Amino acid sequence: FALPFEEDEKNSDVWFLDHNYIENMNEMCKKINAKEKLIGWYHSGPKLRASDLKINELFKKYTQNNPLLLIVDVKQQGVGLPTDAYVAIEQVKDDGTSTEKTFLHLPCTIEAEEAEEIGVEHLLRDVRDQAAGGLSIRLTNQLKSLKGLQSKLKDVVEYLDKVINKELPINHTILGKLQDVFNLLPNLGTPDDDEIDVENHDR
Amino acid sequence: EIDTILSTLRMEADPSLHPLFEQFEKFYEEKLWFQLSESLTKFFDDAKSTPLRLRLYDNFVSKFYDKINQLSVVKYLLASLKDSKDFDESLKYLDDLKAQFQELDSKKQRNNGSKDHGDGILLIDSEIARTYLLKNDLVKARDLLDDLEKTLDKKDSIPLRITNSFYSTNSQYFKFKNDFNSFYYTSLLYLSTLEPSTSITLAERQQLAYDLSISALLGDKIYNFGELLHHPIMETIVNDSNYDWLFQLLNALTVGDFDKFDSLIKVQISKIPILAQHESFLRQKICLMTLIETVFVKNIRMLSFEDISKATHLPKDNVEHLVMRAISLGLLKGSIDQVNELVTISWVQPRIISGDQITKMKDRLVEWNDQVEKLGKKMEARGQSIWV
Amino acid sequence: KEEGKIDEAADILCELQVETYGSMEMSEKIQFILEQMELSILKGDYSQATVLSRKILKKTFKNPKYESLKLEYYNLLVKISLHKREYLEVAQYLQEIYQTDAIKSDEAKWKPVLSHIVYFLVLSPYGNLQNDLIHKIQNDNNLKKLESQESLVKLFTTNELMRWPIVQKTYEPVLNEDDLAFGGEANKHHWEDLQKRVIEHNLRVISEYYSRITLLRLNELLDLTESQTETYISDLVNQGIIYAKVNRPAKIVNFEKPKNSSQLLNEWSHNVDELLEHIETIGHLITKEEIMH
């Protein structure tokens, strides 16, 4: 549920959040369901700000858990991720740098409630983006997946280009993941790859 | 009251320390004692070598410790028993001020409704352990360090300043034992979390530096070398004779040149006996770095023996023994064959990533991307009209 | 004992004392039985000694009043075992003594007790009992109070390729002035055991790291003929410690467990699955890094 909020375009680290409304909400909704307690706050998106780092310290005080930041993309310019989930944590940061406050991405999954499923299918009257039913749906899907793999990979090309040309700081986590990618890359002429070929005859 | 003592201290002090006494009395008259902390710290940098810091600090600490932060009292405390020769002497202030802060946290805090004091205890327990290491009671210090470490994990908001002291006390401990690897990792935490308002002079940077570097060369699993180029402590200290060769030895190690390495070590055997007695470890270390570096940038993930034989400039017999160590340490992982005369690795260990490494990583994804696109075009065209 | 009848004399008394008595108090019974074990060793009968050992219970010596007795009992019990050449049981017996308060407190009583535990842990012939036990001695810093002992245990624990005379040379003057270890006339066959033990560890090393290696090269590594080597490869293929295939022609020895068609196909699915995960998280972190910058 919404809360009152205000924002400034002169310095962007100037804002209003109302605490008094928050107190009243908690009282009311406990009775509705004893399954609603404070678990964090949504930020309406479409993007993560660095100003959301400061706003986070308010919600960290209100509830004793690290508070979830939930980006709800309502402008939907990304073909995946309509929801991104972020929990602010503190970690020591590459390139000789301090303990910095950061937001670490987690799985942002939908699995749905029982309650929810019933209205969702009902409203639905489309053949769905992906459902993976007949062969027709999965032949579409295979070709969709390939475009998918390429799109992620493209952004990565441009990151490595920019470290060595346009001086964004070197983050060894992203370089390290690529090492791991290359060590789980099947090599032709190994016994693993050769087996794939034989199995294709058999299927 | 306190006026006479300061007046005796100023007379003993140099004319260049004279205005700093004047400011203590000037600020006292105003009745701002925060301005007083600022001045006091300055004095103790330039007058730790005179014995006059051991009497100046007590007078201020034992009135104000609540009209000044906990950080201020400990700031003074560290500098005072910094160069002190009697550890029995040293132990007694640490205990007296520990008991003081405990009492403070029950009374002030109710009345103001503000202000913690239990932070100050934490930092004293570091300094008791630090004092134990210096007596050559290494073991004892380690029992309090575990106890403080547990206390720290209770907290979900741990300060920089406090853990900086703690990572420090721990880093001194390992190098007294001459554990090179243990020292280097724990020191990397100390350097990274190092505070902006230091307790570290330019001379103390040199002495720390040296310990960082020696460990680096004399390691056996340390192949992160770029974090001495991402810390000012050793990065801009390289213009000293002592730190000229000491830096060079790292560059030699990094780039896998055997010509440069040979030239350098000849001098450092006769001069330094820590480099001398460990010269065997150090020598095989250069050779292991060649193996992993050379296979990464290549898109293959195997190498022949014949490649290595040329690469490390040693026999084919040596290859067996060094490549074997590489599996044990866990630098590399894989299968070794002598019949087909290969070593085919399945892993490379993570490293700190210099500019050339990133270029090769880039050119790999340009190859990849172009394939996905060609495989895709053919499949969009074939069965274009059937997808229902 | 003095007459020729030491065997006969011991035999009578053990028959008496293997019948518990209620007129005997707890301390007396326990102390008396310990004597009867010593006499079965002198008899030459080691079966009789196992029986007497188990007559008295282990959980009766976990009282502090019976601690005087507890030290005598586990020291005896090693002797019986050691003769029977059970090296695992001895190392586990001596460890009990090591934990004893009396031995630990006084800064010289603990010293040879630890030395002895090292020699039998090493002499034991693999087994997963070896791995846990020997890992406990390693974490202790009372192995950092002796400089001889640390080198020996660590050299047997860690994965190292090494040969017999180099190791033999290191330990030849050191452990020979220590009896109840390697110094004795029968324990010249526990120095002889030491050779097998380092080459039994080599085979474990050699099998993981090296898939296919020449039989010829392997011969010089265990420092024996081909005939001897091949037997000793076989012992550990049967006891399941390694899987190997050895060719008599001296073509190869293929140190491996052979995969099947399915295992290769399974292993190639995981590589491709896990890959995909890494690609997707990377893009998450590009967005973060640039935004904060």
Swiss-Prot record, chain A:
Keywords, alphabetical: Acetylation, Phosphoprotein, Proteasome
The record's account of how the chain is modified after translation: N-acetylated by NAT1.
The keyword Acetylation belongs to this UniProt entry's keyword annotation: yes
Cellular component GO terms held in the UniProt record: proteasome complex; proteasome regulatory particle, lid subcomplex; proteasome storage granule
Organism: Saccharomyces cerevisiae (strain ATCC 204508 / S288c) (Baker's yeast)
Record's function text: Acts as a regulatory subunit of the 26S proteasome which is involved in the ATP-dependent degradation of ubiquitinated proteins.
Section of the entire sequence shown: 52 to 254 of 338
Protein name: 26S proteasome regulatory subunit RPN8
Residues of the MPN domain: 1-92
Recorded GO MF terms: metallopeptidase activity
Gene Ontology BP terms: proteasome-mediated ubiquitin-dependent protein catabolic process; ubiquitin-dependent protein catabolic process
Additional facts recorded: Present with 19800 molecules/cell in log phase SD medium.
UniProt family annotation: Belongs to the peptidase M67A family.
Curated annotation (Swiss-Prot), chain B:
SUPFAM superfamilies: Winged helix' DNA-binding domain (SSF46785)
Superkingdom of the organism of origin: Eukaryota
GO cellular component terms given for this protein: cytosol; nucleus; proteasome complex; proteasome regulatory particle, lid subcomplex; proteasome storage granule
Alphabetic keyword roster: Proteasome
Family the entry assigns: Belongs to the proteasome subunit S11 family.
Alphabetized PANTHER family for the sequence: 26S PROTEASOME NON-ATPASE REGULATORY SUBUNIT 13 (PTHR10539:SF0)
Protein name, UniProt field: 26S proteasome regulatory subunit RPN9
Species of the source: Saccharomyces cerevisiae (strain ATCC 204508 / S288c) (Baker's yeast)
Curated annotation (Swiss-Prot), chain C:
Coiled coil segments of this chain: none
PCI domain: residues covered: 86-260
One GO location term (cellular component): proteasome complex
Top-level taxon in the UniProt lineage: Eukaryota
Biological processes, Gene Ontology terms: proteasome-mediated ubiquitin-dependent protein catabolic process; protein deneddylation
Changes after translation: N-acetylated by NAT1.
Function: Acts as a regulatory subunit of the 26S proteasome which is involved in the ATP-dependent degradation of ubiquitinated proteins.
Additional observations: Present with 5710 molecules/cell in log phase SD medium.
Family: Belongs to the proteasome subunit p55 family.
Protein name listed in UniProt: 26S proteasome regulatory subunit RPN5
